[PDB]
Each structure stands twice: as structure tokens, then as C-alpha cells.
Amino acid sequence: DFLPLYFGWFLTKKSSETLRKAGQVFLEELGNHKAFKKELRHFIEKLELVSYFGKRPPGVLHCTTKFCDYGKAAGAEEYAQQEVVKRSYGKAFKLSISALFVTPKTAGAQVVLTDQELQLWPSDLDKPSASEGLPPGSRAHVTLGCAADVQPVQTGLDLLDILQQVKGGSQGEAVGELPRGKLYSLGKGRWMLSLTKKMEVKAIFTGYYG
Numbered sequence: 001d002f003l004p005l006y007f008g009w010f011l012t013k014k015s016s017e018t019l020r021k022a023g024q025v026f027l028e029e030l031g032n033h034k035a036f037k038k039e040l041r042h043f044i045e046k047l048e049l050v051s052y053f054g055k056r057p058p059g060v061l062h063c064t065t066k067f068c069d070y071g072k073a074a075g076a077e078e079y080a081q082q083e084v085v086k087r088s089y090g091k092a093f094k095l096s097i098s099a100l101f102v103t104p105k106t107a108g109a110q111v112v113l114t115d116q117e118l119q120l121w122p123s124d125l126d127k128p129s130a131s132e133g134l135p136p137g138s139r140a141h142v143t144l145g146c147a148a149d150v151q152p153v154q155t156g157l158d159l160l161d162i163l164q165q166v167k168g169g170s171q172g173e174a175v176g177e178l179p180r181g182k183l184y185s186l187g188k189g190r191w192m193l194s195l196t197k198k199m200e201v202k203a204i205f206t207g208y209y210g
């Protein structure tokens with residue numbers, strides 16, 4: 001038996017719609033913001049970010065736990081064999097999004113996982129060098145878009161990098177108020193919105209087979 005391409009939480013029709021709509025409003029707003037227009041040189045008339053992030057999920061949004069490549073990825077067998085994964089397979093979850101973000105490479109939403117959902121977060125031996133210093137599960141995100149040259153993999157790395165700055169106290173003071181939250185400028189083309197109300201999205205834990 002081969003494993004899926006990857007396991008993860010796949011958001012319902014309605015919830016994918018809410019998050020997608022919310023990510024796309026952020027993009028028109030960030031692209032229209034004075035603070036962003038000024039720093040556009042450190043990013044790349046106005047730039048239309050919805051177009052910039054041309055490579056979008058075409059259907060339902062998802063939050064990846066463990067990329068398996070059908071069993072070719074390190075720790076895939078390990079992960080899939082866990083009681084918690086088999087038990088959770090096909091179960092419903094509510095995910096909490098705390099922030100939307102943008103970099104020159106990706107646009108995503110930061111997921112904050114409950115301890116129960118953390119039981120489903122992988123515990124691999126090959127761990128990212130930007131992951132260290134952050135709790136397990138900090139990589140948890142939903143990808144909203146990518147630049148032409150970029151793989152959706154980059155979104156997770158982009159998120160860790162951004163939070164590696166937050167833990168360093170390197171976010172600074174907010175440079176704007178969008179209707180949903182406070183806008184931060186991390187430098188190096190990076191931007192974070194901390195949501196006033198975290199949005200709850202519904203999702204099913206299952207496997208995706210390409």
C-alpha cells in the first residue's frame with residue numbers, strides 16, 4: 001500500500017471560501033497601503049499583489065501535516081502508521097488562523113494548532129534549520145498564493161522565517177491598521193497581519209493522492 005502524496009486538514013467549501021476571500025482582501029489592501037508602496041524596492045505604478053501571487057490553490061484550501069510522496073519522504077511510513085493518524089483519518093477539525101502574511105515569494109495564513117491537532121503534527125528526524133527555537137507546529141500554515149518561480153513548499157519556510165523574527169522581537173511597532181488587524185513590516189519584503197479575531201475554519205483530516 002502506498003501512502004498519500006501528503007496528509008493534512010482540508011477545509012470545507014464554505015471555510016475555503018472565507019479564508020480565500022479574506023486572503024485576497026489583504027492582498028488588495030496591502031498593495032494599496034502607503035507603507036507597502038514605499039518599500040516596494042525591497043519587494044521587487046502600483047503592484048497588483050493578487051496578480052503577483054498568480055499561482056493559487058484552484059479549489060479547496062488545506063493545511064499540510066506530513067508530506068509523504070507516497071512513501072518516498074523520510075519518516076512517511078513512521079507518520080502514517082501512528083494510531084493518532086489512522087484514528088483521526090476522516091475526522092473534522094476547527095483550525096485557528098492567527099495571521100495572514102506576504103513575502104516576495106508566498107502569501108499564506110498562519111495556523112495555530114490545538115494540542116489535539118499537534119498530536120497529528122509530524123516529529124521528523126530531518127528537521128528544518130529555521131524550525132529550531134520555535135515550538136513544534138509553528139510551520140503550520142495554509143498557502144494562499146506563490147510567485148511564478150516558487151514552490152508552495154516555500155510558504156512554510158517563509159512562515160518560520162517571519163516567526164524567527166517575532167521571537168527575536170524584530171517585528172517592531174505596527175505600521176498600519178487594516179480593518180481586520182494590525183499591519184507589521186518585518187523588512188526584506190515581508191509583511192504580517194495579526195488578526196484581531198482569529199478566524200476559525202472547519203477542515204477534514206485526510207490524505208491527498210495527487
Ligand SMILES: Nc1ncnc2c1ncn2[C@@H]1O[C@H](CO)[C@@H](O)[C@H]1OP(=O)(O)O
Pocket residue numbers: 006063064067141142143152153154155156
Ligand atoms: N518538500 C516538501 N516538504 C514538505 N511539504 C511539501 C514539500 N513539497 C511539497 N510540499 C507540499 O505538498 C503540496 C504539493 O501539492 C504543496 O501544497 C506543499 O504544501 P504547502 O502548501 O503546505 O506548502
